Design a protein around this ligand. Sequence first.
Ligand SMILES: N[C@@H](CCN[C@@H](CCC(=O)O)C(=O)O)C(=O)O
Ligand SMILES: N[C@@H](CCN[C@@H](CCC(=O)O)C(=O)O)C(=O)O
Ligand SMILES: [Br-]
Ligand SMILES: [Br-]
Ligand SMILES: [Br-]
Ligand SMILES: [Br-]
Ligand SMILES: [Br-]
Ligand SMILES: [Br-]
Lengths: 264, 264
Amino acid sequence: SCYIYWDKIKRIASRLEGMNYHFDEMDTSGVMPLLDEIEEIAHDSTIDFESAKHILDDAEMNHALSLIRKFYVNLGMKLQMEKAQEVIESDSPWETLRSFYFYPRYLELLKNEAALGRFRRGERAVFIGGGPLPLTGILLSHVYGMRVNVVEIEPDIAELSRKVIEGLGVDGVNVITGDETVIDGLEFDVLMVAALAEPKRRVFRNIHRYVDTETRIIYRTYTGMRAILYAPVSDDDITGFRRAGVVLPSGKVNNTSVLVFKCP
Amino acid sequence: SCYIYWDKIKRIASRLEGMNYHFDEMDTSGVMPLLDEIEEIAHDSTIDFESAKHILDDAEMNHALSLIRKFYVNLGMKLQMEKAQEVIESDSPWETLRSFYFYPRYLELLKNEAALGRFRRGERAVFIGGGPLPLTGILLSHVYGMRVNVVEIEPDIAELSRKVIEGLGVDGVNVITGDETVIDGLEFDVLMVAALAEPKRRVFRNIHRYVDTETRIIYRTYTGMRAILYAPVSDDDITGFRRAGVVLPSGKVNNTSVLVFKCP
Ligand SMILES: N[C@@H](CCN[C@@H](CCC(=O)O)C(=O)O)C(=O)O
Ligand SMILES: N[C@@H](CCN[C@@H](CCC(=O)O)C(=O)O)C(=O)O
Ligand SMILES: [Br-]
Ligand SMILES: [Br-]
Ligand SMILES: [Br-]
Ligand SMILES: [Br-]
Ligand SMILES: [Br-]
Ligand SMILES: [Br-]
């Protein structure tokens, strides 16, 4: 085979590689064009899922794919870091938060997930992998009226996220510093696994130990050409669970959301 | 994992075990309820492709999958043979043809394919693997006004398919007895490969030698839970071609249709 996307992807990866050579520290404003070139490929609706695997998972794409995925992770993290601090400093913190590049996507994504998980006001939710900008946790309370624990493994990132929540005046959102294993000590009706929470295999094995067969578990993944952004959760990762629902994204939304329940 | 469909599949397969190595001896009328049981699962739109893959790829499912596929291919062949002979003997051949159990699905399948392959009246189509009831060839002319050569490897089957075409009074449909390599001496705009055309490896490697990069090639395969019916075309099979489009079936249609082009 002979996909025209292969050359386009390799050239983007070459640009990323040259950039990384010069700077470890991401220039978030400067790389927005690169992100948009990548998302135009990711959002190409003409490409079916099987074809996406044929193009993205080809052996000769491995190196380029790894560069693009690392870029997406590092950019997303830096954008979150920068926005968190902006929110904390702002006299108009909600207006500041809504300016986050990806903000409207979260509204659409969470709508999807709330239907999939049958979210109800007052239910307890745990979100594993809050990051510096705990937007999903914030929305689960602010929009869905859930009582939320957000879990974050890096103590300084956890601290930042707490200041963001305090800055916005959002109630019902607590941040727990620790790994996924903290769920042993929490009551919850629904558990969500962040798109970038890693390592997947470990996270799901630990989840399996601590949840029961009634716990609604939603995880975020990448399918079709959106897999250019990040490695999907594999079926091996979710051994001991059964899939019970999936929402495929459209528009600009990147994540696929999967509902699973612990067997048996 | 713990899908309800696992046991349901195993149960159906247990009732096929005693027919193993002798499915060709089946009473087609008598086994229709079995096909319905299998299709109940195959056609269940709540089973996502990841779940279907989990079930169907499991080593413990291999024997059951083999039984179901043998049943399906033998029932399909026998239904086709019986119908071909009925049509040839009928005073009302088109009415007889339209009573074929799968007839409505062919209309939908072809409708999807016509859009995918951008079929235009008067275009020249070659169909590899007519079988005794060359319904696709018949409809390509009758519905889409294409000029058709159907290719059939077995002389006796070729003779039967000619009699069906002639019985119906269909114009612009000819049967060529030979292997796939007969396309060397043909001039055509669209090439189609039947769902049951085998061996895929040899067939596609031969196709690659004769077509050019402009030839629209459509092949039929099985995806998701419908792969319970018949082995999907493997990635190995279509090496040297690029995928350009797909139609995934809905309702009762079994086949996925794939548009490919020879590289580059
Ligand atoms: N931050 C969220 C992920 C939210 N994804 C959104 C925003 C855009 C993106 O992440 O590429 C989406 O899918 O469109 C998490 O940690 O799960
Ligand atoms: N006979 C055709 C296949 C026609 N498939 C139809 C009929 C049902 C079936 O084959 O199970 C379909 O997908 O619904 C061929 O060999 O290409
Ligand atoms: Br504000
Ligand atoms: Br988040
Ligand atoms: Br199930
Ligand atoms: Br039975
Ligand atoms: Br057999
Ligand atoms: Br046919």
